[PDB]
From Swiss-Prot, chains A, B, C:
Protein name as it appears in the record: DNA polymerase sliding clamp
Database matches in InterPro entries: DNA_clamp_sf, Pr_cel_nuc_antig, Pr_cel_nuc_antig_C, Pr_cel_nuc_antig_CS, Pr_cel_nuc_antig_N
UniProt keyword Nucleotide-binding present: no
Signal peptide: none
Organism: Thermococcus gammatolerans (strain DSM 15229 / JCM 11827 / EJ3)
NCBIfam families, per the entry: pcna, PRK01115.1-2, PRK01115.1-4
Lineage: Archaea, Methanobacteriati, Methanobacteriota, Thermococci, Thermococcales
Keyword set, alphabetical order: DNA replication, DNA-binding
Presence of the UniProt keyword Phosphoprotein in the record: no
Domain of life from the UniProt record: Archaea
Any one GO biological process: leading strand elongation
Family: Belongs to the PCNA family.
Length: 248, 248, 248
């Protein structure tokens, strides 16, 4: 197999990015091409599809001789990456053998070897879906709304109308409603083709947003009785996309 | 029943204030008048009386049509209020029905409904007591002294003399003494009619001071073999008062 | 027995210093002389020798009438010292009786009495050893390397050569190597008489470095199949020295 070397400036930031996907994933196949790094995986229950796209442009050095796929234990990967410091340079290197060499370069050079595994590749595509509502909002609003809703229920209803986006949860001894309009600082964009209603499991939503930053811009696309697509951008050009099955 | 709307700027600060009283209280009757909000309660053991007085002046909007009392599960109340952000506006609103509508207004509008309960009203008054000692001290000194004393004992002796205030705890394998004079930065005022000695349970004192700030000014009034009155001010005009039975 | 009074400006810093030695020690004899305070102890397994030397020069007041030794329960000592604030003045005073009076002077005067104990004095000396390698490195590199290695193994190999210092750990499903050269910011000095290799137990190393600061300069001296000497300086003139038996 052909070697590669991939270098990312800011090892802690890369660890943070991986930790977001790791919240739902135990293991994943990483497709390494000359265009960038991609990872498409499902959580163990098959409710959430994760797609992480890291173009060559976000890496300070990118040397990929031929496209290849590697399998990674995501919890082992995250344990090693968590050792990286904020100003470390991260080097991901594969030689001829079946392990990933992970180097942090900073005040010292620290090199871990991570055994590569084989990950069953389900044929996963990200199909186009007839979403009728798009919402762009601040991470902090999304994160707090999911925490708010968890105080009352295990499911969160998403309601998009022309002028307002509402997330509402109801339980026996409580009720919570989070409302956004374009007058609100938390709502950056709202495009609604038609009144759209769908509900989503809070346990999955919590794991999806756990690593998202309070100042991150999160795009939500959904439809009535349809999955929720949730994405935010990494270093402008990278993209993390979640696709979440509705609660029906 | 008549509706009301009460608005407080700084929702996290209001949550912090409630959490102080919640440390000893499971449930409480809130008396809502045109003059302000008051709450008088005892801890489950009847050792501590809590009195919280929030005048209309500390609220940015105060619309109370007729005086009424509402009962609140304090742990449920604190769980909701803990969701408020530091720059959220807090709205407490009662309509015709038997629930409190709690709204945080900031980057988004988030509305919780809290069921109102019935709280048995003991006839609680705050009687005047012939205290012989008044002490004003920095919260940090009070908080640290109670923590210091807990290393050695379950009771803390308070000793006030003309020129010095001493808090002393004694155990078998330790002893601790905290001493203040007006030369000390921690002691803001000391008024002693006569030498005054009393002891107080550390477990109650710890719960009383847990939420007090290190820079808060705490007034202590006590007497020999008499209860301890402990108060500090909220937004200059609000007042939290504890009355603690002596250890005899 | 003769009284003494020893005063240290910055009580939290003194607590931090004691906590470093306390990580391996349950009890210790402190030798109090006119020259300073010294403490030599072994951990319960006799794998680590600790030597703490605090010259009179680091104390703001130092009144020792005659040399004497006192025994101290280190966990009780650390519990009291942890109550000191960063800007507290610390007073250690012994009167005629068999207890240490520990005073924090700041916003208030707080005085603890700590019973002195008798500590069996093993005849402990710090012998000169024919070390062949000296390494000066930043605490953060040492601390992170030990944490890195603990991800893969229970022992850490130290390898010093003319131009590079390597710490390497190997396990079944992982491997880690931390490498320093004088080009690296983490390596302040490297003096190697000959190629030097030795291994050390990570559990002991972790407890030795737990309290060391990320910006502290740590000197390591070791030899092949020889103990590791690890020291760093306290207020320029104080010294904490660990001597760690090799893993053979």
């Amino acid at each position: 197999h052909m070697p590669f070397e991939i270098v990312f400036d800011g090892a802690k930031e890369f660890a943070d990015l991986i930790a977001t996907a790791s919240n739902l994933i135990d293991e994943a196949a990483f497709k390494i091409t000359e265009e960038g790094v991609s990872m498409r995986a499902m959580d163990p229950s098959r409710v959430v599809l994760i797609d992480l796209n890291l173009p060559e442009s976000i890496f300070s050095k990118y040397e990929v001789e031929e496209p290849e796929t590697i399998g990674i234990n995501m919890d082992h990967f995250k344990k090693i990456l968590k050792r990286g410091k904020s100003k470390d340079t991260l080097i991901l290197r594969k030689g001829d053998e079946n392990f990933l060499e992970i180097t942090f370069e900073g005040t010292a050079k620290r090199t871990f070897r991570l055994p590569l595994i084989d990950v069953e590749e389900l044929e996963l595509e990200l199909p186009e879906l007839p979403f009728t509502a798009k919402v762009v909002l601040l991470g902090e609003v999304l994160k707090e709304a999911i925490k708010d809703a968890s105080l009352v229920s295990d499911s969160l209803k998403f309601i998009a109308k022309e002028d307002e986006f509402t997330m509402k949860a109801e339980g026996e001894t409580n009720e919570v409603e989070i409302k956004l309009t374009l007058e609100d600082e938390g709502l950056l964009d709202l495009e609604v083709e038609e009144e759209t209603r769908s509900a989503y499991g809070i346990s999955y939503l919590a794991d999806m947003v756990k690593g998202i930053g309070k100042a991150d811009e999160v795009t939500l696309r959904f439809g009535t009785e349809m999955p929720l697509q949730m994405d935010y951008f990494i270093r402008d050009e990278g993209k993390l996309t979640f696709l979440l099955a509705p609660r029906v």
